[PDB]
Amino acid sequence: TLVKDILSKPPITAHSNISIMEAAKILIKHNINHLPIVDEHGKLVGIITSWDIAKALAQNKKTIEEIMTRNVITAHEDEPVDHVAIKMSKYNISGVPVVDDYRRVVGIVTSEDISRLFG
Amino acid sequence: TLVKDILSKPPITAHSNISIMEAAKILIKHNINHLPIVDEHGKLVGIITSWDIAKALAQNKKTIEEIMTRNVITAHEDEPVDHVAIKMSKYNISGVPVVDDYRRVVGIVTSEDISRLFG
Numbered sequence: 001t002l003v004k005d006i007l008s009k010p011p012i013t014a015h016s017n018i019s020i021m022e023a024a025k026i027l028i029k030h031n032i033n034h035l036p037i038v039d040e041h042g043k044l045v046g047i048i049t050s051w052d053i054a055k056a057l058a059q060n061k062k063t064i065e066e067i068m069t070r071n072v073i074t075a076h077e078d079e080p081v082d083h084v085a086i087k088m089s090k091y092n093i094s095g096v097p098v099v100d101d102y103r104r105v106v107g108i109v110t111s112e113d114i115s116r117l118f119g
Numbered sequence: 120t121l122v123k124d125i126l127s128k129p130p131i132t133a134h135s136n137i138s139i140m141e142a143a144k145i146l147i148k149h150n151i152n153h154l155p156i157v158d159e160h161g162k163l164v165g166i167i168t169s170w171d172i173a174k175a176l177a178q179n180k181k182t183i184e185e186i187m188t189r190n191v192i193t194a195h196e197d198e199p200v201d202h203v204a205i206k207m208s209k210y211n212i213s214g215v216p217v218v219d220d221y222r223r224v225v226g227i228v229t230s231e232d233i234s235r236l237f238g
């Protein structure tokens with residue numbers, strides 16, 4: 001089955017012009033663990049997850065841009081699911097932003113979603 | 120295959136008498152996302168993961184005991200692996216403390232480990 005029909009459906013993103021503590025509220029608010037960071041257009045710059053929030057406390061880092069995993073692993077909306085499953089394990093991550101061909105963010109898949117194909 | 124032979128091998132735990140920020144350093148130091156919280160004996164009271172650290176910032180919580188998921192899902196050292204895999208998805212968590220029969224902590228399995236049985 002294709003990623004286009006499993007993914008979380010309007011993405012929640014953030015420009016890097018926000019405080020660590022705001023991001024945290026964002027994550028906690030929607031009950032999410034993955035926050036794609038987008039530029040002014042909407043194109044994909046990096047990814048924050050609760051791990052980064054705890055990195056920020058741990059090393060006294062203060063800005064989103066300082067800690068966002070600058071190089072994000074992503075999925076294409078026509079990329080078969082099974083293949084994304086394999087991808088997240090092999091790289092040990094639980095979520096990928098889904099991108100259109102311009103690196104604009106159209107959604108997100110988490111293992112949380114993949115495990116409704118586990119039954 | 121049995122959990123006893125996949126698990127991470129001396130556990131890293133913490134009594135709740137530590138600061139959020141220390142826990143974070145603990146997680147970042149060993150490169151872990153799961154911190155079992157133990158009492159004076161060593162028996163299993165709750166679990167902290169980086170998610171809780173971001174909950175702590177989010178709601179201005181200040182103590183480990185305030186935020187540790189008081190009721191932890193665990194695995195037995197003779198519990199077959201496959202079954203623990205199923206357990207973490209169905210409950211959407213990536214790590215379980217492994218317990219002996221007195222609820223003392225003997226190890227931990229993460230999906231990170233299970234995915235070396237994925238090949």
Ligand SMILES: CSC[C@H]1O[C@@H](n2cnc3c(N)ncnc32)[C@H](O)[C@@H]1O
Nearest residue numbers: 008011012032033034035108110112
């Ligand atoms: C974390 S489980 C709850 C849901 O949140 C979704 N999710 C996680 N991160 C995001 C995000 N940045 N935008 C939209 N949905 C998300 C996941 O795909 C899952 O369905």
Ligand SMILES: CSC[C@H]1O[C@@H](n2cnc3c(N)ncnc32)[C@H](O)[C@@H]1O
Nearest residue numbers: 047049069071072073092093095096
């Ligand atoms: C696995 S957690 C360690 C790092 O993984 C990063 N991370 C989580 N998901 C992804 C992804 N899809 N691509 C790249 N890095 C990621 C987080 O920002 C964290 O710094």
Ligand SMILES: CSC[C@H]1O[C@@H](n2cnc3c(N)ncnc32)[C@H](O)[C@@H]1O
Nearest residue numbers: 127130131151152153154227229231
């Ligand atoms: C998170 S991936 C790196 C390793 O850390 C292990 N790990 C995670 N949390 C703990 C812990 N509290 N004590 C010992 N090992 C851990 C995992 O089982 C994995 O092998």
Ligand SMILES: CSC[C@H]1O[C@@H](n2cnc3c(N)ncnc32)[C@H](O)[C@@H]1O
Nearest residue numbers: 166168188190191192211212214215
């Ligand atoms: C899935 S993340 C949301 C909550 O899950 C908790 N959590 C993570 N692993 C476990 C586990 N093995 N048992 C119970 N709760 C857990 C974390 O402390 C967090 O508050």
